Tab-separated table of all heavy atoms in Angstrom:
chain	number	residue	atom	x	y	z
T	1	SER	N	-143.300	-9.775	77.093
T	1	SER	CA	-143.660	-9.518	78.455
T	1	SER	C	-144.732	-8.393	78.547
T	1	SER	O	-145.323	-8.138	79.651
T	1	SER	CB	-142.451	-9.188	79.300
T	1	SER	OG	-142.081	-7.895	78.958
T	2	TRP	N	-144.932	-7.651	77.462
T	2	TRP	CA	-145.988	-6.641	77.641
T	2	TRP	C	-147.389	-7.237	77.715
T	2	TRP	O	-147.666	-8.192	76.973
T	2	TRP	CB	-146.012	-5.527	76.613
T	2	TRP	CG	-144.753	-4.921	76.272
T	2	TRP	CD1	-143.539	-5.074	76.893
T	2	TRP	CD2	-144.558	-3.990	75.165
T	2	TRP	NE1	-142.589	-4.276	76.224
T	2	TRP	CE2	-143.199	-3.623	75.158
T	2	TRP	CE3	-145.402	-3.488	74.151
T	2	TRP	CZ2	-142.660	-2.794	74.141
T	2	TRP	CZ3	-144.870	-2.657	73.188
T	2	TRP	CH2	-143.516	-2.302	73.197
T	3	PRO	N	-148.206	-6.738	78.677
T	3	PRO	CA	-149.613	-7.099	78.922
T	3	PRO	C	-150.477	-6.840	77.689
T	3	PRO	O	-151.376	-7.676	77.353
T	3	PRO	CB	-150.048	-6.254	80.131
T	3	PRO	CG	-148.905	-5.746	80.699
T	3	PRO	CD	-147.714	-5.815	79.730
T	4	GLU	N	-150.136	-5.784	76.983
T	4	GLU	CA	-150.835	-5.476	75.743
T	4	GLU	C	-150.570	-6.428	74.656
T	4	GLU	O	-151.351	-6.456	73.761
T	4	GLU	CB	-150.431	-4.051	75.189
T	4	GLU	CG	-150.519	-2.869	76.203
T	4	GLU	CD	-149.321	-2.714	77.054
T	4	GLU	OE1	-148.506	-3.647	77.203
T	4	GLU	OE2	-149.150	-1.613	77.609
T	5	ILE	N	-149.412	-7.108	74.620
T	5	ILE	CA	-149.040	-8.024	73.522
T	5	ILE	C	-149.663	-9.358	73.850
T	5	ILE	O	-149.633	-9.731	74.980
T	5	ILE	CB	-147.529	-8.205	73.563
T	5	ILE	CG1	-146.854	-6.944	73.055
T	5	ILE	CG2	-147.019	-9.454	72.706
T	5	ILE	CD1	-146.714	-7.063	71.565
T	6	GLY	N	-150.195	-10.090	72.866
T	6	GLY	CA	-151.059	-11.215	73.065
T	6	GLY	C	-150.417	-12.440	72.457
T	6	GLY	O	-150.985	-13.577	72.506
T	7	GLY	N	-149.225	-12.301	71.869
T	7	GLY	CA	-148.614	-13.502	71.165
T	7	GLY	C	-147.635	-12.978	70.148
T	7	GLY	O	-147.433	-11.805	70.106
T	8	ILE	N	-147.080	-13.803	69.285
T	8	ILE	CA	-146.200	-13.365	68.273
T	8	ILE	C	-146.903	-13.321	66.926
T	8	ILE	O	-147.644	-14.318	66.514
T	8	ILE	CB	-145.186	-14.442	68.112
T	8	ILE	CG1	-144.379	-14.573	69.381
T	8	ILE	CG2	-144.364	-14.184	66.836
T	8	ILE	CD1	-143.134	-15.399	69.095
T	9	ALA	N	-146.587	-12.263	66.189
T	9	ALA	CA	-147.030	-12.128	64.815
T	9	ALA	C	-146.510	-13.097	63.812
T	9	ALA	O	-145.546	-13.776	64.022
T	9	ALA	CB	-146.709	-10.827	64.353
T	10	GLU	N	-147.142	-13.080	62.661
T	10	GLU	CA	-147.064	-14.094	61.610
T	10	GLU	C	-145.627	-14.195	61.248
T	10	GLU	O	-144.997	-13.204	60.877
T	10	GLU	CB	-147.868	-13.687	60.369
T	10	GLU	CG	-147.692	-12.292	59.955
T	10	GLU	CD	-148.242	-11.979	58.612
T	10	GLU	OE1	-148.212	-12.788	57.704
T	10	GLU	OE2	-148.617	-10.838	58.382
T	11	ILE	N	-145.089	-15.388	61.454
T	11	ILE	CA	-143.702	-15.683	61.209
T	11	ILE	C	-143.708	-15.939	59.703
T	11	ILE	O	-144.370	-16.879	59.209
T	11	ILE	CB	-143.341	-16.901	62.052
T	11	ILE	CG1	-143.114	-16.474	63.481
T	11	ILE	CG2	-142.141	-17.492	61.607
T	11	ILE	CD1	-143.933	-17.285	64.532
T	12	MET	N	-143.051	-15.064	58.962
T	12	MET	CA	-142.964	-15.265	57.525
T	12	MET	C	-141.662	-15.947	57.088
T	12	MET	O	-141.513	-16.244	55.947
T	12	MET	CB	-143.110	-13.948	56.812
T	12	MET	CG	-142.782	-12.692	57.720
T	12	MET	SD	-144.092	-11.109	57.456
T	12	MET	CE	-144.804	-11.433	55.074
T	13	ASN	N	-140.732	-16.177	58.012
T	13	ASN	CA	-139.507	-16.866	57.742
T	13	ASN	C	-139.768	-18.313	57.983
T	13	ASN	O	-139.169	-18.958	58.846
T	13	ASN	CB	-138.440	-16.422	58.697
T	13	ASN	CG	-137.058	-16.542	58.101
T	13	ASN	OD1	-136.648	-17.589	57.477
T	13	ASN	ND2	-136.272	-15.465	58.321
T	14	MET	N	-140.658	-18.844	57.171
T	14	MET	CA	-141.086	-20.197	57.338
T	14	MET	C	-139.975	-21.188	57.328
T	14	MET	O	-139.883	-21.995	58.273
T	14	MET	CB	-142.060	-20.521	56.276
T	14	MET	CG	-143.182	-19.579	56.250
T	14	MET	SD	-144.025	-20.023	54.609
T	14	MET	CE	-142.837	-19.156	53.216
T	15	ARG	N	-139.139	-21.140	56.281
T	15	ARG	CA	-137.900	-21.993	56.156
T	15	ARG	C	-137.041	-21.920	57.417
T	15	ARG	O	-136.714	-22.898	57.990
T	15	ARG	CB	-137.092	-21.602	54.916
T	15	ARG	CG	-135.929	-22.592	54.521
T	15	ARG	CD	-136.362	-24.018	54.066
T	15	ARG	NE	-137.701	-23.915	53.449
T	15	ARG	CZ	-138.642	-24.867	53.436
T	15	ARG	NH1	-138.380	-26.053	54.044
T	15	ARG	NH2	-139.838	-24.610	52.815
T	16	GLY	N	-136.763	-20.705	57.864
T	16	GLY	CA	-136.082	-20.481	59.106
T	16	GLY	C	-136.721	-21.257	60.182
T	16	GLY	O	-136.044	-21.964	60.851
T	17	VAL	N	-138.013	-21.164	60.386
T	17	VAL	CA	-138.596	-21.947	61.438
T	17	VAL	C	-138.462	-23.419	61.175
T	17	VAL	O	-138.191	-24.142	62.137
T	17	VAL	CB	-140.182	-21.584	61.733
T	17	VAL	CG1	-140.981	-22.698	62.411
T	17	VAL	CG2	-140.270	-20.310	62.763
T	18	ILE	N	-138.687	-23.869	59.902
T	18	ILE	CA	-138.509	-25.295	59.526
T	18	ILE	C	-137.089	-25.911	59.705
T	18	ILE	O	-136.970	-26.936	60.341
T	18	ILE	CB	-139.004	-25.644	58.211
T	18	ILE	CG1	-140.467	-25.387	58.172
T	18	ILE	CG2	-139.054	-27.133	58.128
T	18	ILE	CD1	-140.997	-24.932	56.800
T	19	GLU	N	-136.013	-25.282	59.276
T	19	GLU	CA	-134.693	-25.944	59.302
T	19	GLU	C	-134.055	-25.631	60.663
T	19	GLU	O	-132.834	-25.786	60.940
T	19	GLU	CB	-133.874	-25.411	58.164
T	19	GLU	CG	-134.504	-25.410	56.799
T	19	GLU	CD	-134.809	-26.817	56.282
T	19	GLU	OE1	-134.315	-27.915	56.775
T	19	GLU	OE2	-135.627	-26.840	55.336
T	20	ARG	N	-134.887	-25.147	61.560
T	20	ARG	CA	-134.392	-24.860	62.872
T	20	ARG	C	-133.280	-23.792	62.909
T	20	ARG	O	-132.260	-23.935	63.624
T	20	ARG	CB	-134.090	-26.160	63.655
T	20	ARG	CG	-134.023	-25.993	65.214
T	20	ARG	CD	-135.442	-25.923	65.759
T	20	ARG	NE	-135.584	-25.746	67.215
T	20	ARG	CZ	-136.713	-25.327	67.745
T	20	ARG	NH1	-137.770	-25.036	66.915
T	20	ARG	NH2	-136.813	-25.197	69.048
T	21	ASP	N	-133.566	-22.654	62.280
T	21	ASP	CA	-132.721	-21.466	62.488
T	21	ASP	C	-132.735	-20.948	63.857
T	21	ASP	O	-133.790	-20.833	64.442
T	21	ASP	CB	-133.062	-20.319	61.595
T	21	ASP	CG	-132.491	-20.503	60.226
T	21	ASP	OD1	-131.488	-21.293	60.026
T	21	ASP	OD2	-133.065	-19.852	59.342
T	22	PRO	N	-131.577	-20.578	64.345
T	22	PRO	CA	-131.425	-20.229	65.755
T	22	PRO	C	-132.062	-18.888	66.082
T	22	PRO	O	-132.672	-18.741	67.156
T	22	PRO	CB	-129.875	-20.260	66.002
T	22	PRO	CG	-129.240	-20.734	64.542
T	22	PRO	CD	-130.333	-20.475	63.540
T	23	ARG	N	-131.936	-17.908	65.202
T	23	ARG	CA	-132.773	-16.714	65.387
T	23	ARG	C	-134.376	-16.984	65.428
T	23	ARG	O	-135.085	-16.642	66.421
T	23	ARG	CB	-132.344	-15.763	64.293
T	23	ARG	CG	-133.367	-14.757	63.795
T	23	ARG	CD	-133.114	-13.399	64.433
T	23	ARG	NE	-133.453	-12.257	63.615
T	23	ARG	CZ	-132.858	-11.075	63.696
T	23	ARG	NH1	-131.822	-10.873	64.519
T	23	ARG	NH2	-133.301	-10.084	62.923
T	24	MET	N	-134.899	-17.646	64.374
T	24	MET	CA	-136.278	-18.017	64.300
T	24	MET	C	-136.697	-18.959	65.409
T	24	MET	O	-137.761	-18.806	66.056
T	24	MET	CB	-136.490	-18.704	62.989
T	24	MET	CG	-136.704	-17.752	61.883
T	24	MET	SD	-138.026	-16.149	62.490
T	24	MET	CE	-137.004	-14.400	61.865
T	25	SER	N	-135.880	-19.965	65.694
T	25	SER	CA	-136.247	-20.854	66.798
T	25	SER	C	-136.356	-20.121	68.148
T	25	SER	O	-137.215	-20.440	69.011
T	25	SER	CB	-135.277	-22.030	66.826
T	25	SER	OG	-135.178	-22.683	65.519
T	26	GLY	N	-135.523	-19.113	68.339
T	26	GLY	CA	-135.311	-18.622	69.704
T	26	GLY	C	-136.552	-17.803	69.871
T	26	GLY	O	-137.218	-17.815	70.976
T	27	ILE	N	-136.922	-17.096	68.791
T	27	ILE	CA	-138.169	-16.285	68.871
T	27	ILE	C	-139.414	-17.146	69.218
T	27	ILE	O	-140.228	-16.758	70.061
T	27	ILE	CB	-138.356	-15.526	67.598
T	27	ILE	CG1	-137.308	-14.441	67.538
T	27	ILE	CG2	-139.953	-15.047	67.258
T	27	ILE	CD1	-137.415	-13.621	66.084
T	28	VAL	N	-139.588	-18.278	68.552
T	28	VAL	CA	-140.604	-19.292	68.888
T	28	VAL	C	-140.348	-19.963	70.205
T	28	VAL	O	-141.234	-20.198	70.959
T	28	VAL	CB	-140.743	-20.349	67.783
T	28	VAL	CG1	-141.736	-21.391	68.183
T	28	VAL	CG2	-141.202	-19.701	66.474
T	29	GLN	N	-139.133	-20.305	70.566
T	29	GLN	CA	-139.037	-20.677	71.992
T	29	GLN	C	-139.623	-19.621	72.871
T	29	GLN	O	-140.292	-19.881	73.788
T	29	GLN	CB	-137.597	-21.083	72.348
T	29	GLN	CG	-137.309	-22.380	71.439
T	29	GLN	CD	-138.080	-23.591	71.918
T	29	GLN	OE1	-138.126	-23.759	73.124
T	29	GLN	NE2	-138.786	-24.385	71.000
T	30	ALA	N	-139.423	-18.370	72.570
T	30	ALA	CA	-139.791	-17.364	73.543
T	30	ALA	C	-141.298	-17.277	73.550
T	30	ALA	O	-141.871	-17.215	74.646
T	30	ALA	CB	-139.113	-16.068	73.241
T	31	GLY	N	-141.925	-17.388	72.353
T	31	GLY	CA	-143.359	-17.375	72.240
T	31	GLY	C	-143.941	-18.418	73.129
T	31	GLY	O	-145.040	-18.203	73.767
T	32	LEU	N	-143.212	-19.552	73.280
T	32	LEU	CA	-143.705	-20.599	74.161
T	32	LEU	C	-143.357	-20.415	75.542
T	32	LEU	O	-144.061	-20.903	76.437
T	32	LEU	CB	-143.249	-21.918	73.804
T	32	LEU	CG	-143.569	-22.524	72.438
T	32	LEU	CD1	-142.559	-23.747	72.226
T	32	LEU	CD2	-145.068	-22.904	72.356
T	33	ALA	N	-142.292	-19.702	75.845
T	33	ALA	CA	-141.916	-19.708	77.312
T	33	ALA	C	-143.019	-18.905	77.869
T	33	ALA	O	-143.519	-19.199	78.976
T	33	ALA	CB	-140.568	-19.105	77.588
T	34	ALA	N	-143.493	-17.948	77.043
T	34	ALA	CA	-144.490	-16.988	77.494
T	34	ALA	C	-145.911	-17.402	77.436
T	34	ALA	O	-146.750	-16.571	77.773
T	34	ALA	CB	-144.324	-15.610	76.807
T	35	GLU	N	-146.192	-18.646	76.972
T	35	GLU	CA	-147.593	-19.212	76.842
T	35	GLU	C	-148.566	-18.203	76.190
T	35	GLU	O	-149.605	-17.970	76.720
T	35	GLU	CB	-148.155	-19.653	78.189
T	35	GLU	CG	-147.175	-20.543	78.976
T	35	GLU	CD	-147.651	-21.221	80.323
T	35	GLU	OE1	-148.454	-22.194	80.323
T	35	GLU	OE2	-147.211	-20.733	81.413
T	36	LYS	N	-148.218	-17.622	75.043
T	36	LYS	CA	-149.068	-16.719	74.300
T	36	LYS	C	-149.235	-17.230	72.871
T	36	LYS	O	-148.639	-18.309	72.480
T	36	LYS	CB	-148.468	-15.320	74.314
T	36	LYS	CG	-149.070	-14.380	75.321
T	36	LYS	CD	-148.015	-13.517	75.968
T	36	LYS	CE	-148.644	-12.556	77.068
T	36	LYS	NZ	-148.167	-11.121	77.013
């Protein structure tokens, strides 16, 4: 939500994002709710 923040940084938990980890997914859901 900060105006200064422009998006999410490099997700290095690649596997987490791939096998649909709930911590990693939720962070990427949020990156999208926020259209950044």
Side-chain angles (χ1 to χ4, degrees):
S1 75
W2 315 349
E4 309 84 341
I5 287 272
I8 295 195
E10 44 168 325
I11 281 128
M12 21 221 331
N13 208 313
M14 305 169 283
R15 191 66 29 210
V17 157
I18 299 147
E19 310 296 344
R20 200 78 181 162
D21 281 338
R23 153 100 148 209
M24 277 317 131
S25 308
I27 289 177
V28 178
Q29 297 289 318
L32 300 163
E35 311 187 73
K36 261 140 182 225

